[PDB]
Amino acid sequence: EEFDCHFLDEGFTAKDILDQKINEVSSSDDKDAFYVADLGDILKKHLRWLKALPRVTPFYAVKCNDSKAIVKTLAATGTGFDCASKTEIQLVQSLGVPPERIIYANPCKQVSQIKYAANNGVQMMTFDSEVELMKVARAHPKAKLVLRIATDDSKAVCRLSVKFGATLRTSRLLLERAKELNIDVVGVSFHVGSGCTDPETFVQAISDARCVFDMGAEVGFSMYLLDIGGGFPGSEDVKLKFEEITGVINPALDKYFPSDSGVRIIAEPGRYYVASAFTLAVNIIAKKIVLKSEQTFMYYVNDGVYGSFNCILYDHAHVKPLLQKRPKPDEKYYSSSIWGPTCDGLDRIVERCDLPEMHVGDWMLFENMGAYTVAAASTFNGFQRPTIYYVMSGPAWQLMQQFQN
Template sequence: MTGCLDDLDITMVEEGFTTKDLLETLLKEASQRGSREAFFVADLGDVVKKHLRLLKALPRVKPFYALKCNRSKEVVHLLAGLGVGFGCAKKPELALVKSAGVPVDRIICTGPCKQMSHIRYAASQGVQLMTFDNEVELGKVAKSHPSARMILSLATDESRSSGCPSVRFGATLKSCRQLLETAKDMNVEVVGVSFHIGSGCTDPQMFTQSIADARLVFEMGAELGYKMHLLDIGGGFPGAEEAKGRFEEATNVVNSALDLYFPEGCGVEIIAELGRYYVDSAFTFMINIVAKKEVPLDQPGSDDDDPGGKKSFVYHLNDGVYGSFSSVIFNNTCPVPILHKKLSPDSPLYSSSLWGPTGDGLDRIAEGMDLPELHVGDWLIFETMGAYTGPASSSLSGAQPSRIHYAMSRVAWQAVQLLQGKLLPPEEEDQECTCAPLSCGWEITDTLCVTPVFAPASIM
């Protein structure tokens, strides 16, 4: 069975038992063992909620998951069981997805610079869908995987994005015809177009422009005899609850653009390749202070404008940017901690910085924060830690990846079973009602999706 969760280490919790409750339970157990090791709590019910929200907001779009964002086995098996496809950039990612029983037609080999060994491995596994944006990639595929079905990656102008423009990756609209002609000469089949708008983009109209550009590439392909039938609109959808309005705005823009440029019945399959949207808010990180020192205000690591007027502190944590905080380097994030211990509201604040355990000058997590005085052994909580938080280099961090404790509410589990066809919805008591309620706030609608009335296990 695809994406079986039965054999995975997942704690099933009752409705109303939140991530905060589970954190407190785990901290109590750690205290009894004398453990101060950092750990994650992953609310898989939050992943289910995001999936259902996506199905409702983009009914014409089939979701794929960008595995590079978070390679958790439990997340992969959950999404596989929900029918999600996968974008794999490396051989180990492809092997993980295959181990979850995902059929090859739901796998895309992504990445602009694929190694020859990756291409050959994909061919040996029967995976045919691959992306390309230049002639060199076409030549590699033509040589090692001639039966591949290629997707032309189109560059997007992300000048209004907080991230780097994707022009480094993806073909410009001006170069697409030549690439299609080159593919024709190499006898390589091109079946579709993809683009990706980064999650830092705040202008949803970028989707309209990119979808319009993709339409032009489809027309170029038709002129050359290609029968292209796949459009990948990438990701870029925010997943945090506080960004729900921005998510709805973006999906409304996408639906309108699809109706205009790829209307229903045109024969084009629409997919989206999401990463951060699915997992970011589902993961909460607990980490311990392992060292502390007071720093004179005129030394590096301190803030000259000290709100306490007396001290500045540097704290070292037992994980850093070479481990679970790798997003600080790769995505230029600035994680903000929540204090676990209760302090008086009038506690003085001091300029503080957080560092990892390595002593390396780059292992800086955050600085210039106003915090009360903390102590060795105190716990800090970091929310929205599900995306790009894997270890960058185990040899540099000198430690194993932090343990992840997975939890799912029984309500979310029922929703998964329902989507997999293992659980029948209850009979309608009122035959005039258009939906049959499922226990504890879930309902199944007549639009072939399950809609959450409220979150099954909310992040605190």
């Protein structure tokens, strides 16, 4: 099923295919959860990106969703790839992507994995520490290093212990140390984060990147690569929309990294490309009614926080259950909870929402489930991952062909 793709007829959307599949399973017993993945939506996101950020080459963050069909489509489109490990490099290269379209954007890499990158010609890596410089000097000495600088996320849960990113003070020492060890530093990267509330953060980061560029010029480096990272939204169901962010980013890029300077600008978008392309259908497998006389309901579905909905814990996701069958306007709603299939009491998807009374065998839909869902799912309790059905229309395939030409 991984390399299986289905045709999407004219005048049909992913929602229609979802509905169709549901209605054909009504008689049968087998009602496992499943995804519909529209690869056309990914081509749409690429066009949108080419329009909004024409100076910025996108490098897809594979960790977001490592589905071979996703990476194959993006590779045909001509995007780069951000890989964080040996396995992701193997995946991307197995699909025929050359090393110069891969950035190894993990600042803290196991020596053996750095060695693997060196053996397969992946030259560009990020770093933010001296120990990383020593490891690179011993294990991949001809590497092109990108210094990752810190960004301020005022909304982060742990503000005093940031995992990644060098301060400006530390950046100067890192550049001088890299000069000592005869290691080539070719640019700067930063990551604003997914939970960005104010686009001005990007401007500050770009300004900071410029500052580090100047330091590199002082130490004797020929800096050309600016990596503005990821964190762009993957659906329209957010307060801060993609185009607002890009409208703030482009003037900053023109001001601080003008095209005549010879700078090459890239980004590492993960969720932007895939979030909205995947829709999840889960089946209500069990039901309890609790009287409070106000009726309330507990619904158990066949995916949970150990599966696709791990994003509730790891990605701070807020999931919105949608009904497959549109409800009548006068239908009565009830206070309801939604639970996953496992034995664990913390396997709860929705604490409290308003739903009409539903029945075992009814379906619930979750949109915008492409990013950091299947990539981090486990088989706790023995429950297997939902099948993914890939779809693509004819015109979407034509568009992909145009990109290949």
